[PDB]
Amino acid sequence: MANLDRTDDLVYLNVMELVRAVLELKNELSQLPPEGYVVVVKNVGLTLRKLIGSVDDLLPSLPSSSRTEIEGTQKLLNKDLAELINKMRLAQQNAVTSLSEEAKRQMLTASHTLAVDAKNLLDAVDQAKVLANLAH
């Protein structure tokens, strides 16, 4: 088992920031009014954008064949964010109905999937770094 040095690994750092943001959304979805919904989702969105940008900076230096899989995980993150947004809307619309719990529950699930798929990106990026490491 061989871990990577993450001292200046900005992708690693951004994934962590993103996960911390989902954990926050997770722990405070209870003490939040229908207005606080957009706040926590936005925070997740902003840290996602930062993560994806750091990956884009990286992409040109790793071999061209890793770009397929990695762009694949990036698109999966968009789809996950779009889903978190749909579930935010449903929660705002069912704010005073009896489907409020089910909506916020689906919000936690969607953000959860986003965090896990951010990890999937990191593994695809680590795998590309390490493949290329023994290329030449």
Partner: peptide
Amino acid sequence: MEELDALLEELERST
């Protein structure tokens, strides 16, 4: 990846 794996575990316990 030690610090992240611990965050990923906390994420599991949130569930």
